[PDB]
């Protein structure tokens, strides 16, 4: 499969245009918006969602440059979400750097999130497709719902596997799914090709999230400290002995224990909790690949298959 | 003390009631979610008071333009969701468990509402509706951040304070009335009349709100530069100007409460702010000239009078 | 803003929301009439703020007693209609074209809601329910008249002030909680416990309300002798006592607002009344002893704390 | 057949008990309630509804004294309605005497109304019948609705004959209908007999009100016009008069002006036969009440029920 260097090289001409657009579309008459927008936009995100979007639009031989605007739209939505999450979580650090709410305060972060969300809709309007906006209005409502679903799960050790997977789907997979779907919408593909791209995005997002959650136990236990129960921790809790179950249950309820997870890590190894989670990741990764079957052959399709392989490479 | 207050208000509310009930019912359907926590919190913030004004305006405006559909019900709901969301997001405090959960609830319920309003917009199946509301919602956001910037800035101009009023509060009124015209396929001139009515009505409401904060509210405490406080600073004497400046910058206005309120009285600061509100109220009424006569047009005129009732 | 008030309140509302939503929809069904004017006015009165506490109490109480039906929804609506009808009838002014129609609608919509509440009682198909509520509403009528008798009477005792609270306000809370017991077929000591909880909770709320009127002042202008004004008069100096006496006799206090408010502070009048509220609050909590432990019982304790949160 | 003196004489034993009940059952701990309730109960009402109640019960051979309590219940409800109406209408006189709201103020009148209403329910409880309370809670809701329907009609010259009749039924006849129906319920009659007593009370109530509205324009005179209340005589005269007469009646209704000189309005009524038309409706209603009593067993009590129906339209007929 195609490696990251080549994927990026393939995508760079498009990603340069998207970067320019992301930076310029922050503009406002209000200086605080320009500052905070600058800060969040230029803090060094991996820009994975717009990369997906542009590779997808090319894979479907797009004739316009509308995938640049669409890519900018997706990243604005994701950025709006990040700003709000960091206030909601009271995060202090992101991308090795102080968070926007730490630098500018909670109030300003929330409001500029709203500025970026609404700005992303002004941009959607320029694509002149009511369907684009139906999909994204739907997607963003789901994201908001997933955020509350995650809050309901905070410090809840009774959080079920289904509830956990629903948060992955609503809060992460749905936006990847929307991105790839909308590449098909822009290029006027059939329902079945739209479904293929939609599925690749969904399963890819799911894989990325599962692996992020795995990597958190290989700082370690950032999720635990924030009171966020994830599958490795839950599986270990469900299948361990009574003592292991109790300490994990305690850890989830309190958010204590990040500075020494030894007995929790041991429980994961013994129950196969990480292995189980790794298998769901690999599964999702393969499902993303299989979903691309119909897509015409091109270097861009190989790039999309590449990403699905990269998403789980630290686990495969 | 509801049926007492105004003869026009009694008729206004009664005329609007079938529409307002329909809106209330639509809101209860559209606020609903697949997530238990959202339904639990959402119920109380949507159904409570302080929800009446913008939907009332919206349905009265659509009836005045002789709407033939029920799309004004959806539009009324969209406007109140936008309003409720922006309110919740303006309740966010900077750096207890009360404030942490308040912040969380305010952001996430706000986000649910804001996003749901856009879903509802799409059901109207109109690109122009999306263009208008996407621009309006962006301007409201710019408005809210501009207000934040102006917090504790004693050099805030009059123009800048009015830009806040317009962009934060008035723009939404303006969009609501504009869109009544759009849904009913009115001419440009009619659209402009309605747009201007909404704009100026909203401006009046906001100014009057700022006046009533003194004739006591937290604008002084927060160190928010509103017109009455700014004017009194601009027309007070050497020391009066200096204490008000300090109050804005620091927030210690409650220490010097008595002398600050005296300055407002002596400079006629509240009087000046009252004049601007009455002007706005009149500009709203004036903007309706091209609208054909009806009970609904009379209601819209009534609301303009009611906005400044407490300061006329 | 609702979500910043209390962690207890957050949990209580979330816990009650499924019931409170059902009550809301039931109220809208049962407020409807064949007379368009009743619907036009009724809509706004029933969906206003200040509608939530008594239904909240009722559903929480019925859940705390493990109710197996949805009759608590009907009971909650009945209790809110009674409250609303009585409020409307307490808005009547003695003698103004706004005030003429205001009286008419207040009386007539009040009568509609009062009568509709009795029709709803009958659907519960319990003679004990009819007996309890006929007694409660009669006592509430008595309490409102005793309040009217005390208007402008400076020789009003502390006992007499309390008797109004028990009859006018607390009795409704008491009936609501008792009836939760009755509908769930509890024992006397349980009924007695719930009854007492309602009584003292309602007493606490009313005491705090009277304090909050002077930490805002409508009661002063009307010459309504509440405990904060009376205590100040009893323990003020000769002049302060005479000023407060006159203020009650003639409804004149707004002229002497500053000396009077100062007297309340100087005499500890507000603090004294705050203590009585805290006593009531605590008596209500103590009354729940025999109630099985549950999240709903915990919610009722939370309500008791919330009643005096602004005071405590 | 039977004259008013014989009717009152026959009913005297029951009405003594009822009068005592009505005076005693006002009792409360609150002095102002005792005062105001005393004033209204002892101001000299006709006691027509309790009279009707007790005659109806005797006619159905009631074995208990529950009809005293029922009759007192009905009068208390009627009394609560008067107190509220006089506040809504801002009336100053009643039974040649200052109204309670004039003596005590509006607020007290309204609240004491509520006291009487709730007290009447406390008395209903003692009859230990849920169906009774269903009937009276339904009846009293319809009364309340009727009061608002009347309010909507105030100063409205476009008030229809149907809307005017609907007010009569809901505001006046419905309580008569319920009184006599409940005399059937208390004595365990069949559905056919309940319906018969129900209809007698309804049509009787209708007749009384129609005559009241007619008598407002014959011999204070024109009391309804002043309150902006369009009644059938005035409305009919408007519909069938010429353009000038129509215009002045339309003006009279909208403004509530003209009570002190009705000359041209009365002339319009004479010419259009508007009083005559309204008299026919009253007679019709009276006859409808008598027909309705066809299945009730004979007695001096039934003959008093027929006698009241004849008495209702005496002045007119």
PDB file of C-alpha atoms in Angstrom, chain A residues 13 23 36 43 74 98 120 132 152 155 159 162 226 279 308 315:
ATOM      1  CA  UNK A  13      -1.415  20.839  -4.186  1.00  0.00           C
ATOM      2  CA  UNK A  23      -6.667  30.799   7.184  1.00  0.00           C
ATOM      3  CA  UNK A  36      -8.393  33.323  18.366  1.00  0.00           C
ATOM      4  CA  UNK A  43      -1.659  25.379  16.197  1.00  0.00           C
ATOM      5  CA  UNK A  74     -15.285  20.181   7.381  1.00  0.00           C
ATOM      6  CA  UNK A  98      -1.884  26.007  25.637  1.00  0.00           C
ATOM      7  CA  UNK A 120     -18.879  27.124   7.582  1.00  0.00           C
ATOM      8  CA  UNK A 132     -24.965  19.424   1.198  1.00  0.00           C
ATOM      9  CA  UNK A 152     -23.509  11.110  30.385  1.00  0.00           C
ATOM     10  CA  UNK A 155     -17.278   8.708  35.454  1.00  0.00           C
ATOM     11  CA  UNK A 159     -21.188   2.483  30.536  1.00  0.00           C
ATOM     12  CA  UNK A 162     -23.026  -0.046  22.835  1.00  0.00           C
ATOM     13  CA  UNK A 226     -10.886  13.130  32.366  1.00  0.00           C
ATOM     14  CA  UNK A 279      -9.321  -6.432  16.727  1.00  0.00           C
ATOM     15  CA  UNK A 308      -6.972   2.870   6.205  1.00  0.00           C
ATOM     16  CA  UNK A 315      -1.617  -1.896  16.264  1.00  0.00           C
TER      17      UNK A 315
END
